[PDB]
Amino acid sequence: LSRLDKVEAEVQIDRLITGRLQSLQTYVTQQLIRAAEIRASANLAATKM
Amino acid sequence: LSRLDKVEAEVQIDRLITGRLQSLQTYVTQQLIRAAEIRASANLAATKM
Amino acid sequence: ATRFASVYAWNRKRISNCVADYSVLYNSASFSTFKCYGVSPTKLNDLCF
Amino acid sequence: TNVYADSFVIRGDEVRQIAPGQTGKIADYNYKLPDDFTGCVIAWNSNNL
Numbered sequence: 001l002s003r004l005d006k007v008e009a010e011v012q013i014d015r016l017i018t019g020r021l022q023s024l025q026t027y028v029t030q031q032l033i034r035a036a037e038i039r040a041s042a043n044l045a046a047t048k049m
Numbered sequence: 050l051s052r053l054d055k056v057e058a059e060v061q062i063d064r065l066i067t068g069r070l071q072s073l074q075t076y077v078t079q080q081l082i083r084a085a086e087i088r089a090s091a092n093l094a095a096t097k098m
Numbered sequence: 099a100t101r102f103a104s105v106y107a108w109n110r111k112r113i114s115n116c117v118a119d120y121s122v123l124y125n126s127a128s129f130s131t132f133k134c135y136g137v138s139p140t141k142l143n144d145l146c147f
Numbered sequence: 148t149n150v151y152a153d154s155f156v157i158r159g160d161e162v163r164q165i166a167p168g169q170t171g172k173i174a175d176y177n178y179k180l181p182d183d184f185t186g187c188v189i190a191w192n193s194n195n196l
Contacts, residue, residue, distance in 0.1 A: 039086075040089065043089075138170075139170055
């Protein structure tokens with residue numbers, strides 16, 4: 001922001017949006033899968049209890 | 050399509066292609082995880098039956 | 099300067115330890131082209147190199 | 148729904164300075180076209196006029 005202006009600062013910020021949104025989406029996908037794994041483990045633990 | 054002709058129009062259309070592919074892929078990933086959860090639930094239900 | 103260097107022997111000078119003002123240079127009359135990369139012409143008055 | 152026609156005269160060197168989102172004295176001090184501009188810029192040399 002402190003170097004460019006809107007017309008092209010937006011061009012760069014859009015690249016950063018793409019990158020960071022992709023990273024956060026990957027993290028959330030991994031967390032969903034891991035949470036499903038933990039759900040299976042907790043169901044097993046409850047059955048064992 | 051009704052405003053931009055070909056070369057300057059594809060530059061914008063591909064943006065929608067990327068966005069909507071990302072959205073549809075997110076939807077399909079969520080559905081895969083949810084269907085795995087329902088698979089586990091159905092297996093439990095069949096065992097209970 | 100009275101004489102600009104030849105491209106065959108282009109001249110180079112270094113600027114350090116001073117306070118600048120690029121607004122007066124950007125808007126001055128004689129300048130046919132004043133174009134920047136990686137920084138905006140209006141923004142130069144708020145960075146410190 | 149409506150069209151706006153803006154008419155003026157300018158130096159030939161300065162016809163490079165009228166494009167939307169562009170920078171320069173004729174833009175920031177006389178007549179600025181926004182980033183959301185949708186239209187057409189038209190110009191022609193006018194010696195005899």
